[PDB]
Task: inverse folding
């Protein structure tokens, strides 16, 4: 039993799982294991147990945590049912608290209850009065006695009132019901008993929890200290960046086991926004197009092309040798009209190019001056209508011929040299909405905890409200008029006679980089002038959004019409009027974050609202969650370093990158993937993003929230793996066609997550390395994303929530010469390499080592930062690590030395020569010096014999100014330094001791040993590492 029941302890468990007879049942167990019992004397012991039990009960406000009512009771002297098991050694009782069975006992199958007490399968439980019995049943709550009052509980009490009335009271008054128990300490048989149960929750409404996080959602990083000033407010004003997960907890007392939930997010901004739009098609009656104009069709990102629609009375349009047949046909009250759809381009194309799938035209009906409309169709009455391309070389002109009513007309098109891109710039009130799902499980009923995406990759709709307006002029037999919409789109009506219709209109699409042409919305206005009691001028028009796929432009949904009416009895008149207008665009999965960021809904001023839905038991939340958005640029830093950092194998230079927008999952080393499907939400089905924790990618089938739902074999499973080459780098593997759809905390691949269009990413983010002078860079053109494994550091013990990510990425760099020319089979050690996890090795040759360097560049991983900060270059940062020059010296221990001594010290000192012990320098031939160091190891590679310098000359000046330079023959080096080898004095110290033989020097000169030999000694060495020479001297003295 989890949690445990203690020695001599009481404990309680709320009954749950399939086969549990009723809601609001709690069991109590007393661990009577500590004493002897038999059927002969059991009635004593069970009676002894029950009399000491006390039970407490409350009603609470589920949001605020306030106690509303409290009651406290004990079992009656008789009429209870209470039971014993010899096998599991417990006394126990079950009590039924909510309606029904508040007052009457409900039977409990011995099968079900045995799940908790398996002894009930081993043998029958004992009853009161000591018999074996086949069944267990509740003691009802209304039977018990008020400890305050010494009477059976009355129907007037608010707690018993509430418990019987929970069904509506949970929602209507935010009421929650809670119970706990305690066994008043007592002695039996020289043993004793004591305890208090953990609280159990009977019921509560379905809500976002509001304690301690008063917004229901929280960012673990803001709560710990790692975000500056904003940490002060983590409990009531949560923030998060664009593509990541934010944490939350729900209470659900209905469900059991795992539960799919679905969420609805609504995004909003204070004040109106300036938006860019572009013209896809212009549609008109042949009277409204101008006598001549110059035009050439534009081509959108998807590959679709702009078109021109002409409506006419005639069965053809005619142009000499060229005949143009209509695309479709319609009628208004028996009068017949045809629609011709044209692309002005390259050549007179006989077969179709693209289509409109369905298209609504709208007119004021004579019957009412109230809007009506129809779908234009083919002659065979099918819906999709062909569009055709026509034209020629630049500067060519075509005349088309047609009729409007009984009057012929001609229009002259000049095929322009450059595409006719046209824009509208409007201010709109805009808002958006989106949907999402995940499958949450719990270790602790009734609390379900999870995370959800800041921006789900799925269809989003963006919607707004604006104005349309007309100015008009009336005459005895005709009207003239103009309209404005979308701030600076203008349409103009040719003067309409009494008893004639005419049309104008536009299809428009957003004007930005990636998404142009992919979604659009159509407005067509019919107009009418007629006379009743007054002259009547009237407008009626469709508003309908569309999307483009496979050269079809299609009605996604169709909205309610609008109308305007102007009237006067006066023959001369000027008039004015206005109406609201609606505007809806729908996005597509790969494009959704980019779209929100471009339109301006995502930024430091954005606020989000969130509501939730339980798929299985069908409930919506009685409250909402709230959070706000953020955009933050990166920064780079390093711990101060000196010459020590490059001496010895256990030293390095640390660089830290601060970039919070690269943390997508708050657990460092966490991974999730995502796909798009239909989701159940309330009484409807909508598309939305489904999150799936792990390293695998799915193309799932069916509808999320029903038995139709099934996810097949993984299409790919990404992994970081060890690989070939010296050291052993860890790097990413997986089919990169699916890399958008995968999320991680590694900046060297994260920039793909939802940021790929036409198979290519919009941002080249992440880390870049270049190194000098031995020419090397990472990554090579050949490299996968995720060429190195690189993770954010995790929060430590005094932090409230340990083990969660900090925005710091900590990266370690080694530069050395000592392992140059080491080998690993065929491999030769040269240049730059990745090692372990966050580690780089740069290896160079001996003379190239001083002044060598690495430059690191960091570019942001998130498209919001590229958008708001492009102006200033604040989205990229640099740092450089370089090896400084150091002082070196050669010295005798004293300026003077006696010819009494046989030998003297001569010390060479240079920091960069220092290593682990032992290490030694062997001399020989023409003054060569060879460095050796068998205890040097670095990631398994080990140092080879290095030639670091040479002794240049060995000289004496004699007592008269004559100078002798001793030639560096083998015999001369042999005699002068019989200890041919120098030794390091202390670990990683720069110092070695040589010993120069004065008793040698005497004989070596062939001089009169002491007689003439008041002399000065002078010696010189050259090192390749600094490029300096070192020189040293001593006076040789004898008794005078
Ligand atoms: C905020 O919400 C975050 C949601 O993203 C939570 O992150 C999840 O953290 C889990 C562990 O958290 C525990 O420890 C932290 C301290 O770091 C505590 O604060 C928490 O209270 C909690 O105690 C983590 O679970 C995994 O690691 C556990 C080790 O601690 C281990 O016992 C589990 O078995 C998990 O492996 C989640 O990490 C991912 O978990 C999923 C499985 S599941 O989602 O847990 O069911 C793994 O997917 C699986 O991968 C295996 C490969 O071996 C496949 O075989 C299998 O098909 C597939 O399901 C992921 O690999 C693993 O990374 C982590 N969730 C995610 C998606 O990252 C976070 O804890 C919340 N914060 C707080 C304060 O509660
Ligand atoms: C969205 O709001 C975020 C919260 O303020 C902003 O994040 C903060 O970014 C600051 C640097 O960018 C600032 O300067 C730009 C022009 O140079 C301009 O776009 C904005 O003015 C923008 O805020 C950075 O603040 C530093 O610079 C400020 C100059 O305006 C100065 O007021 C600050 O004292 C600071 O030097 C923030 O970095 C953090 O600064 C903390 C100081 S405090 O602001 O908490 O007092 C410090 O404790 C911490 O170590 C350091 O990281 C940075 N804030 C955060 C949360 O890290 C963000 O830029 C706004 N986004 C937009 C769209 O502008
Ligand atoms: C698509 O079909 C259209 C309909 O038949 C064609 O439109 C006609 O275009 C003529 C020009 O096309 C010629 O020159 C092109 C080079 O710029 C070449 O690519 C074509 O192969 C073709 O040879 C145009 O003729 C006008 O321009 C001529 C310049 O070369 C010149 O002859 C005159 O200046 C002339 O006005 C047609 O316009 C009409 O021409 C009538 C005389 S005739 O040329 O038919 O003999 C004239 O009476 C009338 O005023 C004028 O409007 C024009 N036809 C119409 C009425 O649309 C188009 O070429 C086809 N496109 C391709 C290349 O496939
Ligand atoms: C949320 O997570 C729940 C787990 O916590 C999921 O329940 C598990 O469902 C498993 C199959 O999942 C697949 O089919 C679902 C449609 O029914 C679909 O919703 C899922 O997305 C997914 O495509 C199921 O595993 C059984 O079937 C497997 C074949 O797919 C087979 O490999 C298994 O051996 C197993 O028979 C689990 O159901 C039950 O599992 C018992 C234990 S075990 O064998 O898994 O160890 C088994 O004894 C019993 O016969 C079987 O019915 C089930 N897991 C558990 C432990 O309950 C749930 O589907 C998820 N909900 C959604 C909507 O995604
Ligand atoms: C440390 O760096 C020093 C500076 O770069 C290197 O110094 C160079 O020394 C070369 C001789 O060293 C060779 O033999 C060693 C055996 O004792 C061996 O350990 C070395 O790996 C290396 O192979 C010297 O090269 C010349 O002398 C050779 C006679 O031994 C002869 O065979 C060569 O043909 C060559 O003339 C370099 O001196 C300069 O060399 C120039 C050409 S190049 O060798 O640099 O390509 C030449 O144009 C010029 O006239 C001559 O003075 C000398 N390099 C420089 C630029 O001073 C030292 O070897 C490195 N130590 C190690 C072990 O890495
Ligand atoms: C419709 O869709 C396409 C494809 O995304 C887009 O073309 C690309 O536009 C960018 C810049 O976009 C902005 O400026 C143009 C006007 O120049 C506006 O129309 C847009 O609304 C944007 O405000 C061009 O610069 C691209 O040319 C490429 O530039 C790259 C550098 S970049 O950082 O500037 O993008 C170079 O690396 C490429 O070599 C070069 O081709 C252009 N891309 C292509 C493939 O032509 C259109 O502008 C969009 N048109 C509409 C209606 O807005
Ligand atoms: C565009 O013109 C089309 C004709 O070119 C119109 O299509 C016709 O629509 C009628 C009424 O909806 C439909 O019944 C016709 O189908 C034919 O019906 C014939 C019998 S009858 O209707 O002539 O009495 C049958 O011979 C046979 O079932 C169909 O051929 C349909 N006509 C054709 C030729 O398909 C269409 O209505 C028009 N669009 C508008 C809105 O004006
Ligand atoms: C839109 O244009 C149509 C032309 O394709 C018009 O069609 C006309 O049909 C009417 C019957 O409704 C018929 O009287 C016409 O027949 C011709 O009459 C000519 C002279 S006139 O009467 O138009 O002045 C003669 O020249 C000729 O030999 C006849 O064939 C017919 N008009 C034509 C010229 O064919 C129609 O008026 C119009 N519809 C709408 C919606 O207003
Ligand atoms: C009363 O006290 C006993 C002393 O604390 C204690 O027994 C110890 O705990 C477990 C045995 O009980 C559990 O395990 C079984 C499943 O194997 C369940 O059926 C049961 O409900 C309990 O969860 C055992 O591991 C441990 O060795 C025992 N310790 C010793 C040495 O006595 C019981 O936990 C408690 N009595 C009962 C039966 O609940
Ligand atoms: C219930 O009855 C049993 C006897 O049936 C009691 O167990 C005996 O107790 C004595 C001392 O108390 C022990 O020395 C024996 O080992 C036990 N005998 C048997 C037969 O087990 C038990 O103590 C009684 N319990 C109570 C509380 O009265
Ligand atoms: C979030 O947006 C949704 C739009 O889906 C809104 O919910 C709608 O409410 C309107 C009336 O305000 C009703 O016509 C619909 O029944 C609701 N829509 C659907 C599809 O359920 C609502 O405006 C926003 N909700 C919140 C949390 O404010
Ligand atoms: C490295 O080792 C040398 C050993 O020669 C150290 O030199 C000695 O320094 C102390 C004081 O620090 C003097 O008392 C001695 O006289 C020096 N020895 C000789 C032979 O002169 C040197 O201090 C060490 N340096 C570092 C950086 O560890
Ligand atoms: C390290 O610094 C030393 C000292 O300034 C440099 O060597 C000196 O400068 C020139 C070389 O251009 C020589 O002629 C002198 O003899 C050197 N001076 C001394 C004190 O002997 C050296 O250039 C620097 N090393 C590197 C490679 O950066
Ligand atoms: C759009 O045109 C194409 C012809 O390529 C056809 O696939 C489709 O039936 C039309 N409309 C739709 C998507 O119904």
Result:
């Amino acid at each position: 039993l989890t949690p445990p029941v203690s020695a001599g302890g009481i404990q309680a468990y709320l009954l749950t799982g399939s086969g549990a007879p009723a809601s609001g049942l709690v069991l109590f167990v007393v661990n009577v294991s500590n004493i002897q019992v038999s059927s002969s004397n059991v009635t004593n012991v069970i009676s002894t147990v029950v009399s000491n039990i006390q039970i407490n009960a409350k009603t609470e406000n589920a949001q605020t945590g306030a106690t509303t009512g409290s009651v406290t009771v004990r079992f009656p002297t008789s009429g209870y049912n209470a039971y014993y098991d010899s096998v599991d050694k417990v006394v126990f009782v079950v009590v039924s608290f909510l309606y029904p069975y508040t007052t009457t006992s409900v039977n409990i199958p011995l099968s079900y209850l045995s799940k908790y007490l398996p002894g009930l399968l081993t043998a029958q439980p004992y009853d009161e009065t000591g018999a074996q019995v086949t069944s267990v049943s509740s003691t009802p709550f209304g039977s018990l006695i008020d400890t305050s009052t010494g009477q059976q509980i009355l129907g007037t009490n608010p707690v018993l009132t509430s418990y019987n009335s929970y069904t509506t009271q949970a929602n209507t008054n935010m009421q929650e019901g809670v119970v706990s128990g305690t066994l008043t300490s007592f002695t039996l048989g020289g043993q004793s008993f004591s305890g208090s149960t953990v609280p159990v929750i009977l019921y509560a409404p379905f809500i976002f929890s509001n304690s301690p996080y008063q917004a229901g959602l929280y960012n673990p990083m803001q709560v710990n200290g790692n975000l500056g000033s904003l940490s002060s407010e983590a409990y009531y004003h949560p923030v998060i960046w664009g593509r990541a997960l934010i944490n939350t907890t729900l209470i659900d007392t209905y469900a059991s086991g795992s539960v799919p939930f679905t969420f609805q997010l609504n995004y909003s901004v204070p004040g109106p926004l300036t938006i860019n739009m572009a013209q896809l098609a212009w549609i008109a009656s042949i009277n409204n197009l101008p006598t001549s104009f110059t035009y050439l069709s534009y081509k959108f990102s998807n590959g679709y092309e702009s078109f021109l629609g002409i409506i006419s009375n005639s069965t053809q349009l005619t142009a000499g040798a060229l005949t143009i047949n209509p695309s479709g046909n319609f009628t208004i009250n028996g009068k017949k009209f045809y629609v011709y759809l044209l692309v002005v381009g390259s050549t007179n194309s006989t077969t179709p190019v693209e289509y409109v799938t369905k298209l609504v035209v709208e007119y004021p009906s004579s019957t009412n001056f109230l809007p009506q409309g129809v779908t234009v169709t083919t002659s065979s009455n099918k819906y999709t209508l062909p569009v055709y391309e026509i034209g020629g070389p630049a500067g060519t002109t075509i005349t088309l011929t047609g009729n409007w009513y009984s009057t012929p007309y001609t229009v002259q098109i000049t095929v322009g040299s450059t595409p006719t891109l046209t824009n509208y710039v409007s201010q709109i009130l805009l808002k958006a909405v989106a949907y999402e799902g995940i499958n949450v499980s719990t270790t602790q009923s009734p609390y379900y905890s999870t995370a959800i995406l800041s921006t789900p990759p799925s269809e989003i709709s963006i919607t707004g409200s604006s104005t349309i307006t007309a100015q008009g002029k009336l005459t005895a037999t005709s009207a003239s008029a103009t309209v404005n919409l979308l701030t600076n789109a203008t349409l103009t009506y040719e003067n309409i006679p009494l008893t004639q219709y005419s049309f104008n209109g536009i299809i428009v699409t957003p004007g930005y980089a990636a998404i142009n042409g992919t979604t659009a919305m159509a407005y067509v206005i019919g107009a009418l002038y007629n006379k009743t009691s007054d002259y009547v001028l009237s407008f009626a028009g469709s508003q309908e959004p569309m999307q483009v796929m496979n050269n079809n432009l299609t009605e996604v949904t169709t909205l309610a019409p609008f109308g305007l009416t102007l009237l006067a009895p006066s023959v001369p008149a000027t008039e004015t009027g206005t109406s609201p207008l609606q505007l809806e665009f729908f996005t597509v999965p790969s494009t959704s974050y980019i779209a929100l960021v471009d339109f301006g809904l995502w930024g430091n001023l954005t606020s989000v609202t969130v509501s939730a839905y339980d798929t299985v038991n069908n409930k919506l939340s009685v409250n909402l969650g709230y959070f706000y958005g953020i955009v933050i640029p990166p920064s780079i830093s390093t711990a101060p370093y000196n010459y020590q950092n490059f001496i010895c194998p256990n030293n390095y230079v640390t660089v830290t990158i601060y970039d919070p927008d690269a943390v997508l999952d708050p657990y460092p080393s966490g991974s999730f993937t995502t796909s798009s499907l239909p989701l159940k939400y309330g009484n409807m089905n909508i598309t939305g993003a489904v999150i799936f924790p792990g390293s695998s990618v799915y193309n799932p089938s069916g509808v999320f929230g029903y038995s139709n739902f099934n996810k097949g074999a993984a299409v790919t499973t990404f992994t970081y793996t060890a690989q070939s080459g010296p050291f052993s780098p860890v790097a990413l593997t997986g089919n990169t066609n699916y890399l958008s759809q995968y999320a991680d905390n590694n900046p060297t691949d994260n920039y793909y997550f939802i940021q790929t269009v036409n198979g290519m990413p919009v941002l080249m983010g992440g880390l870049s390395i270049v190194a000098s002078p031995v020419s090397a860079s990472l990554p090579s053109s050949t490299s996968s994303p995720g060429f190195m494994y690189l993770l954010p550091s995790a929060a430590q013990v005094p932090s409230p929530l340990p083990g969660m990510a900090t925005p710091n990425y900590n990266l370690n760099i080694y530069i050395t010469y000592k392992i140059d020319g080491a080998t690993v089979g065929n491999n030769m050690i040269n240049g730059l390499y990745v090692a372990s996890q966050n580690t780089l090795i740069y290896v160079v040759p001996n003379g190239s080592f001083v002044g060598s360097n690495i430059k690191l560049t960091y570019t942001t991983t998130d498209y919001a930062v590229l958008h708001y900060f492009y102006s200033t270059g604040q989205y990229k940062v640099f740092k450089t690590v370089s090896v400084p020059n150091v002082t070196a010296n050669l010295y005798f221990p004293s300026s003077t030395t006696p010819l009494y001594q046989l030998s003297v010290p001569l010390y060479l000192s240079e920091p960069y020569y220092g290593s682990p012990l032992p290490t030694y320098i062997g001399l020989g031939t023409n003054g060569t010096s060879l460095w050796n160091s068998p205890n040097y190891v670095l990631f398994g590679v080990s140092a080879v014999q290095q030639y670091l310098g040479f002794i240049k000359s060995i000289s004496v000046t004699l007592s008269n100014g004559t100078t002798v330079v001793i030639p560096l023959t083998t015999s001369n080096m042999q005699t002068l330094f019989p200890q041919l080898v120098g030794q390091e004095l202390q670990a990683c110290n720069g110092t070695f001791q040589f010993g120069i033989s004065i008793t040698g020097l005497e004989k070596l000169l062939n001089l009169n040993v002491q007689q003439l030999n008041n002399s000065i000694l002078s010696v010189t060495y050259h090192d390749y590492v600094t490029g300096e020479t070192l020189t040293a001297t001593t006076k040789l003295v004898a008794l005078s």
About this structure: The CA atoms of residues 578 and 756 lie 43 Å apart. The longest strand covers residues 423-440. The chain is about 5% helix and 45% strand.
